[PDB]
Amino acid sequence: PGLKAKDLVGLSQEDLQRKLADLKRELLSLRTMKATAGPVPERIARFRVCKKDVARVLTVINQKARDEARAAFEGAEHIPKTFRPRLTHAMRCQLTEKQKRLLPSKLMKRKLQFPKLKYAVK
Amino acid sequence: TANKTLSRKLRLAKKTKTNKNIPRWVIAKDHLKKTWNYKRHHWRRSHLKL
Amino acid sequence: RKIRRRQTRLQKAKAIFPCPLQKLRPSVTRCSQKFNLTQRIGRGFTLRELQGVGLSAGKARQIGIAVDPRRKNKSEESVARNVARLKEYLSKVTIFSKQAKPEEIQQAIQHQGVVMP
Amino acid sequence: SKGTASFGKRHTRIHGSCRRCGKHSFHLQKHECASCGYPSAKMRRYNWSYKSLRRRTQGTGSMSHMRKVYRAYNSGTLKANARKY
Amino acid sequence: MKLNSAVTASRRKCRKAYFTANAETRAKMMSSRLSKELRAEHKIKTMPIRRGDIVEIFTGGHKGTGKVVEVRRRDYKICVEGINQKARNPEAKPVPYPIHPSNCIIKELYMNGSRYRAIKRRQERNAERLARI
RNA sequence: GCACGCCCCGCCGGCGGAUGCCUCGGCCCGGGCGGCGACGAAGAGCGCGGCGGAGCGCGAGACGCGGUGCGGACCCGCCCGCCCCGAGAAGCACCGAUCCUCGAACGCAGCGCGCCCCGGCGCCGCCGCCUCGGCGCCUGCC
RNA sequence: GGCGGGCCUGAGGCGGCGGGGGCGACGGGCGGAACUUAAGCAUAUCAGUACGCCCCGGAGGAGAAACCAACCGGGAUUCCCCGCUAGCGGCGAGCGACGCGGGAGGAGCCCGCCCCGAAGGCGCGCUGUGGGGCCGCGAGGGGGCCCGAGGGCCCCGCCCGAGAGGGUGCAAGCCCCGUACGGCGAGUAGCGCUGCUUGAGCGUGCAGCGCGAAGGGAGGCGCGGCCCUUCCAAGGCUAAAUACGCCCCGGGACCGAUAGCGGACCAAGUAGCGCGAGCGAACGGUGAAAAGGACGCCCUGCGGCCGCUCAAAAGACCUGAACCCGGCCGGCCGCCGGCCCGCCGGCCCCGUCUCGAAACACGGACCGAGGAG
RNA sequence: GCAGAGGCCCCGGGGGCGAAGGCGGCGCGCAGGCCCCGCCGGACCGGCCUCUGGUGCAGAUCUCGGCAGCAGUAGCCGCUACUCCGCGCCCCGGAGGACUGAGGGGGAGACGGGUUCCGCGGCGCCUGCAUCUGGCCGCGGGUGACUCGGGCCUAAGCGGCGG
């Protein structure tokens, strides 16, 4: 396996950018070694692992950034569209249940006047 | 053709890259039995983009 | 289709257990000379018929009685027969209050089919 | 003269690759995709050839977004809808 | 008869499900009866076969007792140590004769730790059933 | 005459793919569903696997990455990577991200060129807002 | 005159929010054929259809009577059953509703006007805001014979709330998976003329233009009068029953690889073809297990021979037909009849239209599959 | 006679002690056809009654697939042409003899193709004879710009414009 994501989460974003630079330079030298050693393939099971490793550092760097930014715009009108509830285009363009069930004042009085009654006939 | 466009050069490039036989190891891994790319093309007989 | 329509009726019956599925509808002489003597269910009781049983349009709708204000009574006999239907239904119907005691609602028994056919 | 000799004078590309549909159907003089319909906003879809509709239609490609959304509605999108509503 | 309509009796659907089953389904289908002693100790009739489980073949030719060196989930077959195709050349290294796991009884089980947890789960669900629900 | 060509007393060999038998596929008929998109759809092009052509699946975090709950030994070749009351293979279900170019396709073209601060830069509505035009209707001052 | 201010119209920029495009069905709105039928062909029919365009939604549209009727009357809409005839039509070919009656399903309302006015959704607004599914266990079979292998036989058992089904080396309730049993109201109405449309006929619905009300509309033959019965157009909302592809699930007196989708084949709308719109294939099956061919003999080598694995080569593959062809053996020969069997006798090439075909009439090299009440 | 459906086939129809199919030979039926035996084959198959139909082929310039006789036949007739020797191929090298003959069978661009380019190996395919050849097959490479061309300008034209 490679770098465990949980260990990376504990690191600060400065520590993680340093780790990412080291992993991208490592990938560059593995690509160099794969090109230079053209006649015989060596499997290079460090190459595959460090490709995944770079992704697992990038996932932790985005997760920390999205969570931090989300709290800057938490409880604010007009948050960025990335931080908006996912829904769908139709749902995001639809009346809320309160607005669907809004009744005119005279109709509302009539509903209250005559409540629904449980009744049984025999 | 010597004065090629970039877009055209890149579409033609993929055709050369994908004009490859099935790797022998892939036939062993997949137990393919049939052994020919078929999508392979020959410059004289093929009419790419025609 | 028969199974699907039945399932819909069974779910609706469960939603309002004590309340019967069908509203009380009036006895109407079938239209034309051909069907004059025979009677059939109509849309709703006229306001005059619901003035004879002493009800109001809103009150009748709560006891599950369909009301039609378009329906004009025509003959005096029509008012009397339908007023009698309302009197029979009002005695038959039982209105549960106190929010909902589970036992009284459980023993209510759903009516099935047209009420007062 | 009408055929073989005149076929010898064929050395030009009447059509080119379409940006929208990537077929050799963009006319280079008139600038219109015979199949894609580009430069039009709407796609060229005609009900006389149902075979043409079947060759390029929803589901021929990956349908990467729609597949995701359909599964989510069958999972936890419906709940997020009720929470918003 | 089958009263749940959702289960399919259609030969085509059932054959397809066997051929295309997921690896977790494949592993459950690849199960073998536990020996009398194992049934008494683990209180379960059969277990999914793994590697390291000594099995006795009780059915067709190539009947023998051995550990399972390999499991071919794609072929729904297992390889039992000792059970091999006859070799034309004594020098040639033996090729295993694949055995369906239904054709074997598990004399000994590789206990592991997850296997203790999975036997326990089945034993507890089996007991709720044996209490007549 | 013989050979040839016919016929076939049989006996074999060829060439073809018929006939049977099956069959992870069709085809009808019911249910269920009705869930796309400027928060970038459908579609398209180029990529991406240690060995990798096609198909699938992804998108420069690429034949995937994370989180949780399952599962519990494999991983179609060669590898190497696991292996173990947890240490975690295949598999499974959600959920969170990433997401090149084109495309309703959005600075302008379609692969070439700008403007501008550092946010960016398409169009049409709607509602406010700010700036200001009119010898439209007048008004006040000096 | 010149400047400031309001109001009224516009202009640029910013912010928030919406719009656009996709889907071979169902749905709404439009534009709109022709082949065809009429044994010709103009009206008609096809058909208020194909196709083109535009627009939604899970349904849509429709919808709470300016309704139907003529009664010992009903009562929004949609959908189903029945009447399929009332009518229409070169009254020709054809075409064509509806009200009753039986059902499914049921549910009602609002605005303008009108009164009060800013009490309001308050930068607006007095040209009137506001009120009146997941998860889970899961029963019971041995012995002999024999087989490459039982899931075969032959004796005996057992479990069935489970003898649906699939797999497993030959036909398995008991070998495996599962199955049965669980749990969490005005440019309007109308009218005049015109075009389109309907079954609607001196006008069914619509529309252009001209003219245009007030108590008005309808009652299936126009006009003028008088009644009568029934309703309120020129504004808006509305669930339910109803329709239906993609996809998902289940089933079938369905098809079985020239069939069934064009497409069962690890890569089909693929390979390939056409400048393009577009067109568009073929291709299933070794075996239980790859055990996919030991060894020796030879060959310059290629390759051959022995045999090997297997139950069997079943050797790039199941069975392996016909046509067609090579070896070897037997004859000299078409069909029908007679006989020991190569002689005698008879015999034109079928299908087909046709008065009449062996026809110098037409179709047919051959064989297999498919092929038409 | 064919294909499916509902029953039956007295201990619950016939089957790896050999199903269907194929091939040769009987027998039975006026005949459609059926039945048996041997051989190949290798897993399914019927008789009877009731039911259902995409139910029986010699023709259709029938569809699709194979394939015969013609037949080792017609042909392999342009662009002057090859020969000797050597690992000796139409490869290659040397030597003779030629030819295209500077609007070249010469050397380069535009377009169109799209790797055909080059080196190494190879002949299973193709090179209508052959191949040790090659544009063929496999493998590994290959196109470097301030000054050349695009880009840029406008032409014929085309798109855009409150509307």
**DSSP secondary structure string, E36-105?**
HHHHHHH--SEEE--SS--EEE-SSSS--EE-EEEEEGGGTEEEEEEEEPPPSSSSSPPPEEEE-GGGEE
Q: C34 by DSSP, 3-state: which?
A: coil
**Taking the C-alpha atoms of E68, E73, E77 and E80 in order, what is their torsion angle to the nearest 10 degrees?**
-10
CA dihedral D29, D34, D37, D43 (to 10 degrees): -170
CB neighbours of B47 closer than 8 A, spacing ≥ 6?
none
Contact B36, D46 (CB under 8 A): no
Query: Are residues A118 and C100 in contact, defined by beta-carbon separation less than 8 angstroms?
Result: yes
Please report the sign of the dihedral spanned by the C-alpha atoms of residue C105, residue C107, residue C113, residue C115: negative
Contact flag C111-A122 (C-beta cutoff 8 Å): yes
Whether the CB of D19 is below 8 Å from some CB of chain B: the reply is no
Sign of the torsion formed by the C-alpha atoms of E47, E53, E57 and E61: positive
User: Resolution to 1 decimal, in Å?
Assistant: 3.3
Give D49 CA → G18 C1' in Å. 36
Q: How far apart are the first and last CA of chain E?
A: 22
User: Which position has the token pair 């060759």?
Assistant: D55
- Please check whether residue A57 is in contact with residue A20, taking contact to mean a CB–CB distance below 8 angstroms: yes
In chain C, DSSP finds a helix count (H) and a strand count (E) of 5, 3
Spanning CA of A93 to C1' of G211, the rounded length in angstroms is 49
Question: How far apart are the C-alpha atoms of A50 and E77, rounded to whole Å?
Answer: 36
Q: Do chains B and C touch (3 or more CB pairs under 8 A)?
A: no
- H or E segment to which residue E121 belongs: helix E114-130
Q: How far apart are CA E33 and CA E109, in angstroms?
A: 11
User: Are E79 and E96 within 8 A, CB to CB?
Assistant: yes
Considering CB atoms only, which of A117, A118, A121 is closest to C89? A121
Is E30 exposed, middle or buried (CB count within 10 Å of its CB: 0-12, 13-18, 19+)?
Answer: buried
Residue C114: count other Cβ atoms within 10 Å of its Cβ: 13
What whole-number distance in Å separates Cα of residue C19 and Cα of residue C111? 8
- Smallest CA–C1' distance to G173, residue: E1
- Helix/strand/coil percentages in chain D, nearest 5: 35, 10, 55
Collapsing DSSP states into helix, strand and coil, what is residue C104?
helix
Cα C109 to Cα A84, C19, C21, C104, D10: the distances in Å are 50, 9, 12, 10, 89
**E133 vs E127: CA distance, rounded Å:** 9
The end-to-end CA distance of chain D, in Å, is 74
- Do residues C114 and C20 make contact, with C-beta atoms less than 8 angstroms apart? no
Q: Is D58 annotated as contributing to ligand binding?
A: no
Question: Encoding tokens for residue D27?
Answer: 């006319």
Contacts with D, B 10-29, CB within 8 Å: 11
Q: Which run of H or E residues covers position B2?
A: none
Distances (CA, A) of C82 to A54, C48, C72, C97: 84, 10, 13, 28
